[PDB]
Amino acid sequence: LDSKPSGNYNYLYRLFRKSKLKPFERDISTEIYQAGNKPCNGVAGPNCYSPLQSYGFRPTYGVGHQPYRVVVLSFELLHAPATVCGPKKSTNLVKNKC
C-alpha cells in the first residue's frame, strides 16, 4: 500500500527537538534548530537545520526499513459513567421450567 518507486517523500520524520516530549503530546512545528550559539536570524544555512526530513519509502526495502502501519489503542479508566461496554450476549429462553 505505502512506498513508491519514485520515492514516498510525503510522510516526514522529526529528528530534532530542543527537549524531550510528554506522553500524548503532538508537536506540529517545522521551526529552525539552533545548533550554533549564534542566532540564525530567520531561515539560515550554517548551523541552522530543519528538524523534519522525509522518509522516502520504496517497495524494495528490507524488513527493518519497510513502511509499517501502526494503530495504537489506549484505554482510559476515568471515574465516569462508562460509554463502551463489552458485547455480553444471551441464550434462548425456556418455558415453564425451574
Partner 1 sequence: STIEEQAKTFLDKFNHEAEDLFYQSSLASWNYNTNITEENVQNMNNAGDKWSAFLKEQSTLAQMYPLQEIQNLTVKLQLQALQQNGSSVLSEDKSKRLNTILNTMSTIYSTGKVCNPDNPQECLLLEPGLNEIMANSLDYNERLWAWESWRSEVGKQLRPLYEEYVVLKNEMARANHYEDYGDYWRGDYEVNGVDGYDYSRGQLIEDVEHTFEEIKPLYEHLHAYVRAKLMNAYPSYISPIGCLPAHLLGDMWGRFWTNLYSLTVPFGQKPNIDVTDAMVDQAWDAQRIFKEAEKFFVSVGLPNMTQGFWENSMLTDPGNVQKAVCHPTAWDLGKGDFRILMCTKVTMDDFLTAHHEMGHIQYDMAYAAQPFLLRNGANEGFHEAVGEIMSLSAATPKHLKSIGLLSPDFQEDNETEINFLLKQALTIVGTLPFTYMLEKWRWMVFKGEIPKDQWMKKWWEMKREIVGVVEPVPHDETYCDPASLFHVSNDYSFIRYYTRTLYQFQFQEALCQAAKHEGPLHKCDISNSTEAGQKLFNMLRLGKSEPWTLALENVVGAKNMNVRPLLNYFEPLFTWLKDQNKNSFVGWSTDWSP
- CB contact at 8 A, 15 and 53: yes
In the complex, what is the shortest distance from the CB of residue 23 to partner 1, in angstroms, rounded to a whole number? 24
2-31: which residues touch partner 1 (CB under 8 A)?
A: 15-16
- CB contact at 8 A, 67 and 3: yes
DSSP state of 47: T
Please, which residue, 27 or 65, has the CB nearer to partner 1? Answer: 65
Q: Between 46 and 75, how does the x/- string for binding to partner 1 read (CB under 8 A)?
A: xx-x---xx-x-x-xxxxxxx---------
Please, which residue, 27 or 36, has the CB nearer to partner 1? Answer: 36
- The C-alpha cell at 68 is 509499517
- Burial class, 60, CB count within 10 angstroms (exposed 0-12 / middle 13-18 / buried 19+): exposed
Query: Per CB under 8 A, which region of 20-28, 42-50, 69-77, 86-94 contacts partner 1?
Result: 42-50
| Strand (E) or helix (H) holding 57 | none
Kindly list the residues in this chain that would bind partner 1 in the complex (CB under 8 A).
Answer: 15-16, 33-37, 46-47, 49, 53-54, 56, 58, 60-66
